[PDB]
Amino acid sequence: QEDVLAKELEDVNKWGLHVFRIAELSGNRPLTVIMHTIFQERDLLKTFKIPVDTLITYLMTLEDHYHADVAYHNNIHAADVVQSTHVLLSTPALEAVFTDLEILAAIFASAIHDVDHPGVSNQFLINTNSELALMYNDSSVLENHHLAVGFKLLQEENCDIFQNLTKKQRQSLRKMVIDIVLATDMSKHMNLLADLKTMVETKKVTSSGVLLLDNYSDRIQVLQNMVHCADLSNPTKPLQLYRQWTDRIMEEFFRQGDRERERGMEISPMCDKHNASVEKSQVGFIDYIVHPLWETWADLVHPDAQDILDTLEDNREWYQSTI
Amino acid sequence: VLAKELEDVNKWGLHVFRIAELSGNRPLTVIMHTIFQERDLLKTFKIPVDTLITYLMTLEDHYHADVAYHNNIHAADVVQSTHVLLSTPALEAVFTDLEILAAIFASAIHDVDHPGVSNQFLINTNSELALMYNDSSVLENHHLAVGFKLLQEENCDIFQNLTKKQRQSLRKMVIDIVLATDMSKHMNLLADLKTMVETKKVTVLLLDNYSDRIQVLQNMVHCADLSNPTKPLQLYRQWTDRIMEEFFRQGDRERERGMEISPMCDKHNASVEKSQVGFIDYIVHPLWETWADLVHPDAQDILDTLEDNREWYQSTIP
Numbered sequence A: 001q002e003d004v005l006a007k008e009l010e011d012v013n014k015w016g017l018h019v020f021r022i023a024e025l026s027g028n029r030p031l032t033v034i035m036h037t038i039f040q041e042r043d044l045l046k047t048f049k050i051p052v053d054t055l056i057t058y059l060m061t062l063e064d065h066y067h068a069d070v071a072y073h074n075n076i077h078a079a080d081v082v083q084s085t086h087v088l089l090s091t092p093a094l095e096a097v098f099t100d101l102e103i104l105a106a107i108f109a110s111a112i113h114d115v116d117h118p119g120v121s122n123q124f125l126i127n128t129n130s131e132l133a134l135m136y137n138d139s140s141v142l143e144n145h146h147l148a149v150g151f152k153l154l155q156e157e158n159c160d161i162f163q164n165l166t167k168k169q170r171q172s173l174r175k176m177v178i179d180i181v182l183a184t185d186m187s188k189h190m191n192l193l194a195d196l197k198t199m200v201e202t203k204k205v206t207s208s209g210v211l212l213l214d215n216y217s218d219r220i221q222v223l224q225n226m227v228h229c230a231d232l233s234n235p236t237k238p239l240q241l242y243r244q245w246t247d248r249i250m251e252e253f254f255r256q257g258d259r260e261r262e263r264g265m266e267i268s269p270m271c272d273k274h275n276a277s278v279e280k281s282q283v284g285f286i287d288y289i290v291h292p293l294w295e296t297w298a299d300l301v302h303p304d305a306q307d308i309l310d311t312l313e314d315n316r317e318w319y320q321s322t323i
Numbered sequence B: 001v002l003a004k005e006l007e008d009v010n011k012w013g014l015h016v017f018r019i020a021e022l023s024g025n026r027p028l029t030v031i032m033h034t035i036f037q038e039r040d041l042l043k044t045f046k047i048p049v050d051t052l053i054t055y056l057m058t059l060e061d062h063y064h065a066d067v068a069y070h071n072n073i074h075a076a077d078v079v080q081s082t083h084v085l086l087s088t089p090a091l092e093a094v095f096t097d098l099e100i101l102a103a104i105f106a107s108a109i110h111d112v113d114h115p116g117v118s119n120q121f122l123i124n125t126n127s128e129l130a131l132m133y134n135d136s137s138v139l140e141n142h143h144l145a146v147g148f149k150l151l152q153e154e155n156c157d158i159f160q161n162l163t164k165k166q167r168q169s170l171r172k173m174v175i176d177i178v179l180a181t182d183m184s185k186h187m188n189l190l191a192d193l194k195t196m197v198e199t200k201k202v203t204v205l206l207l208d209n210y211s212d213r214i215q216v217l218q219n220m221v222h223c224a225d226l227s228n229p230t231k232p233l234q235l236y237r238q239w240t241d242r243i244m245e246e247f248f249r250q251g252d253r254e255r256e257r258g259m260e261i262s263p264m265c266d267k268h269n270a271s272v273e274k275s276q277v278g279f280i281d282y283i284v285h286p287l288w289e290t291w292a293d294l295v296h297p298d299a300q301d302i303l304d305t306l307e308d309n310r311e312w313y314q315s316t317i318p
């Protein structure tokens, strides 16, 4: 029903949106309806003269190119990252900091950032001599692919949502989107976090108390880390959402491990369904990856993200308590 | 006949155009085969000679015969120049046989399927290649992908007898080297070579960590790629004629499409000779001067010839 879905989408500005309920109520179109809602909320159709029928046509085609048969890296994950990026962009420490084009780039990058993901890792694709790894010379294999598909779909019939941007706007947005999606490669995490830490330690704020970002390198680095935080935000969400994300990533990992075991390869970490500890893996994920990242983001925008960090820390203690 | 010319495969200034003619437009194949035997690579890595020839022929076929510069003759020239640079005395022990294999294979594939237009042209025209590769080292990613993909054709897997680790190490090194031939990386590459020269440790060069060794290999193949002005003048002048034909054809396409014409690509305004002098002064000589410092004094004859050729091109400007 449309009324109940409209009611749920009133939460689009809130951390912890019931994204699985929105997927059900929208008829498995969470990415389309959440993107459309966000574009209306931020007045992006009027600002960039995006025809509404073109937006819907592109969104439905993009959503179609996520795999409905992968447990984690599907259109619900994309919708979740889009919405989480949308909330992070609204944080008071960043008010009036980014232009309308940078906002468009960050939201578009989130929407396409995992498109056509096959449900296995870059290393699996490299180690199996996949056609994707051969195409991309073993370097950010999935992320180059997500970008290429995301942009190529703009060329389908009535899909060019950027048709009314100027040529310079299109060139700038394309560069920013590429910079952002390539930064979601998990092998870049340590370098991205090291740079975010440096920016926190050298942070400057303006007279209005918002973050001072006066060059492309700093601006794109904040947008890269923002989308990376959104991508790694599952343990910061209310527990009933977090546990569903955990169930889904473990299913994807175990299916990868079954293909590795069947092929005689070493099983990747956390992918052996016969020797895995789901709870210990979440605590380690939080301790070594997610909390170091979110604690640093929370410092950059202090005190805006304190409640998100509080939820992360509660969820860590809950998983720890199940061991 | 063709055999006599191949006797100087170990000399800077091989008559590569004569070899291209005398081999029926197969310079990459015959030069690669000759080099693999001078370095005993077929025995070291147990490469079936017929597999080596089948792959080389196939690779050569994927260079475009209607591209005046970035064709199979260029690929053969860079291969042969790397082969000579690998024999620099100051590098007499630095690199292992697999590293030698990687530098030579990388040279052979480093421009395969080149369309005769630049990365910037491919980006600004919204080409399929730039869409595939997200505007980042577009050509060089493609050269690699084609070069490795051809290994999978029938009786083309020249690395069939390398160990699994050797194949994985060779692949990484080839990728690192070919990606470094992107001209947009030149200044960063040169800066690293300069830093290495300043921190140079010698007994002969001592390079201990992979990062330093791959950097020397990157800069070496880069030097080979940019070696035309260091060759004997009759060779250099042919390379100049060929690159200018390729540039002018690209500029004809940019003019028509309404784009800004790339530097040196406007046939109605370009000075071929001024462009060569500027090319040497700003790119080729700073690079080869720094290389010469790294292997001092083994590059001094190459540097001398470059400086002679620069003097000659300058004298052709009224």
Ligand SMILES: COc1cc2c(cc1OC)[C@H](CCc1c[nH]c3ccccc13)N(C=O)CC2
Pocket: A186, A234, A235, A245, A246, A249, A270, A281, A282, A284, A285, A289
């Ligand atoms: C909800 O839980 C998860 C969600 C996700 C992951 C792992 C989760 O739980 C262990 C992994 C992290 C990959 C990864 C790379 N290096 C690591 C080192 C340690 C741990 C993980 C990783 N993802 C894979 O695409 C993203 C989503």
Ligand SMILES: COc1cc2c(cc1OC)[C@H](CCc1c[nH]c3ccccc13)N(C=O)CC2
Pocket: B183, B228, B229, B239, B240, B243, B263, B264, B275, B276, B279, B283
């Ligand atoms: C024999 O002469 C040449 C040979 C080559 C080039 C230029 C030559 O002569 C002007 C260019 C150099 C790169 C380059 C592209 N745009 C530039 C602008 C300024 C400086 C360098 C470049 N190449 C292009 O594939 C490699 C071979």
Ligand SMILES: [Mg+2]
Pocket: A113, A114, A142, A184, A185
């Ligand atoms: Mg991803």
Ligand SMILES: [Mg+2]
Pocket: B110, B111, B139, B181, B182
């Ligand atoms: Mg090239």
Ligand SMILES: [Zn+2]
Pocket: A077, A081, A113, A114, A231
């Ligand atoms: Zn993701």
Ligand SMILES: [Zn+2]
Pocket: B074, B078, B110, B111, B225
């Ligand atoms: Zn080349």
